[PDB]
Symmetry: C3
Subunit: 333 residues, 3 copies
């Protein structure tokens, strides 16, 4: 946007001044280098002084700006901390965006630190809300805390993620019940909305899993997603039963969403397996060239082979589930 | 949209699996090498055991997955067949995308053949619909079939459908003229605005249908059609200013531009064709200068290229002339 | 829509001559073959047919280039009359149409007359207080100065560019006047728009300044920018005393970005000079016999550079105030 270009312009602008500063200095040196040719000549020395003043001047400009920028980040910090307390989702999320941006402007600083801590509160609060996308966002923001940081904040961040997973799971549980409760009542509109929500929890679960990369987390997300198709399959039935032609498309479209979700999870797992083996080869590559085998390393190699057997085994399992989802089309009609 | 986004991903995903096989299968081969050095290294036998099993897993994953998708496409190709029967153009248009979407995934197979047959039915349906843009989209879908397999029965049908689309468009264009005269008698420029507007869309629509077919003759019929539409604009302009809708009459003089656009687009294609032809002619001659003996079979086609190339230029000018006749009225 | 056409037009004329060449190359093929063996009659015919079509294609260019000129002439006349029209949207159309004529055929006389037409329109566009439009008058007019610099025309642009500036400053002043009224009345939407109007003036003025390039122009733009935030601080407090408070903060964020824009513009100028100054220098150190007049040129650039850097400071301080004020 306009402000997002200007933030880069802020990051760019600062770099530009150093760029100009060099140009002064590189030019200065040339005048400095002309000095040695005719040292006695004062005029050149006078010139150096003029251009030097410019350099010194410019330095202050950096000082002011970096102060001003840092000051603006402080002001930006405050808005977030306040936006963290307000329970409204957009307000809390707005606290995140403002927070994250302060970091991007200048990571690895104590100003960023307070912004890092500020995020944490928001994600916990967002973790309370049951909107899947919101819960996904907290995972996004929470994961950013760890990925940027193994740190205590990350250790706390993991809890928010953990809370998020459980929060997403409970959100999955209740919507399942309501979606379940509706079938005997026969209101398909509530079902299509109830159905879509679990899927949202599946995405979240998948999205959250990737960010921390837990195959188990992928599995739970995997567990969630598969049920959805069965739930979507049954929703298509109530639509076919009650003469509800529009909803059928909502059921039909939901089927594809999970497939890509499942596919998204499948491809998510396979990328890890790729990495895992490559670790083994580099690890293995040392053994053959190794003077003497090292058990701690050799055992480490084993786990890699064994976990690939894990990760590969997961792919096989989920593959059937993905094949199951396809089955729902033929049987019902 | 995001369903079409995934189809690239799913096809891509397969390659990473096949990629993983060679990674694993290669990695095993190295372990095989280590075992070759010391054929009695029990652990080396143990490690290899895991991998050939893991390979068996993935090997199963593929056959499962690619079979799963084959059955999947079956759903999509089947469901679209029902959509074609329905009269809702949007549903058909939607139906087209699925059959269209299918072919991209698995070109050249039997199921794609079933998609092609489906695509035509919906395309044939759109030739009946009177919306000029819709008549174009049908052609657009129809031509894709001719591209997939020329010289087939479907290639025959497609050209047969594309022809009907060109036919249908003129009827709507004729209709506006009929309704145009009514607008003249009933003194309502606003109607003629859309009436002429519909005509303009036809010529534009007809060009696009002309382009895919890439037949110079059809282009001139589209050109001839467009040339009159420019005259209609003048007929719209005169009646409009007098009878009380200048601001709407502002669109007509603006519409006069669109005709010039269509005329430019027609000529651009006509030349682009002509350039290609003359290139081949040069190529054919090049073969003939080098050749030990002139093979009349090549010469005959070479000359025919020149003859055909000539016709286009004549076609180009008479069009180029009409383009001015369009401007001159302005 | 139209954007594609003018470009699409340019190719076709280019491709036409381009096509004409391929024909002559084919003729070159038959001319050589013919020279190798005069006896082949079949070459002559194919030459003739190849020769026949070339004339037609050559003719078509004449038809088209002529016809294209007529439309450029027609648009010029319609552009002029639309120029007369007071309605502002009509004014743009004239420009938009008038520019098309120029970019379609730079340097031509017909193009010269349109550029002349163009110039009249911006003057009419200058009068209207809407800041967004004022820049447009400055925008299109500046294009003319670059197309025909230093001519009798360029002075009109420069003078026309100046006229907007004198007019523009008052439209921002009207906002200051409107807000004090808006403040007493208490309409939060009414007060915010005045700031956004003042903010618009800023971005417009710097663009006008940046487009002419004079460091002075950006300087006059400097003083206004600072006090917009002092206004923007009031509106949020007026709205507090939801929709209006959230945007009031945004306005401050738009000002600082505007300060930044002014900053980058000062710099780019400044930095370009030092290359020129350094490049200027190298020639001096190199040339055995120095040319004192050229030395002076160098000096004024280093002096100017110092002058331009000072401004950055003077600006950067004002900018600094804006952030503090927003605290």
């Amino acid at each position: 946007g306009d402000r997002s270009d200007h933030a880069k312009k802020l990051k760019t602008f600062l770099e530009n001044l150093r760029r100009h500063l060099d140009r002064l200095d590189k030019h200065i040196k040339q005048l400095r280098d002309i000095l040695s040719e005719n040292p006695e000549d004062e005029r050149v020395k006078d010139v150096i002084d003029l251009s030097e003043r410019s350099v010194r001047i410019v330095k202050t400009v950096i000082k002011i700006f970096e102060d001003s920028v840092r000051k603006l980040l402080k002001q930006i910090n405050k808005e977030a901390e306040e936006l963290a307390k307000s329970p409204d989702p957009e307000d809390l999320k707005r606290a995140v965006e403002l927070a994250e941006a302060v970091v991007r402007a200048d990571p690895g600083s104590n100003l960023s630190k307070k912004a890092l801590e500020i995020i944490l509160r928001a994600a916990a609060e967002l973790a309370k809300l049951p909107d899947p996308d919101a819960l996904a966002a907290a995972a996004r923001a929470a994961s950013k805390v760890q990925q940027e940081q193994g740190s205590n904040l990350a250790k706390a961040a993991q809890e928010i993620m953990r809370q998020a997973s459980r929060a997403a799971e409970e959100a999955a549980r209740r919507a399942k019940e309501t979606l379940e409760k509706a079938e005997k009542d026969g209101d398909p509109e509530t079902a299509l909305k109830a159905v879509e929500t679990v899927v949202k929890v599946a995405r979240a679960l998948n999205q959250i899993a990737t960010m921390a990369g837990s195959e188990e987390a992928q599995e739970r997300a995997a567990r969630v997603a598969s049920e959805a198709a069965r739930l979507a399959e049954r929703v298509l039935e109530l639509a076919e039963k009650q003469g509800d032609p529009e909803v059928a498309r909502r059921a039909r479209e939901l089927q594809e969403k999970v497939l890509d979700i499942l596919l998204d999870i499948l491809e998510q797992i396979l990328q890890t397996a790729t990495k895992i083996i490559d670790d083994a080869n580099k690890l293995l590559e040392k053994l053959r060239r190794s003077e003497r085998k090292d058990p701690k390393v050799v055992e480490t190699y084993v786990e890699l082979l064994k976990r690939h057997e894990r990760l590969v085994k997961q792919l096989l399992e989920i593959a059937k589930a993905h094949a199951e989802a396809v089955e729902g089309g033929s049987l019902e009609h």
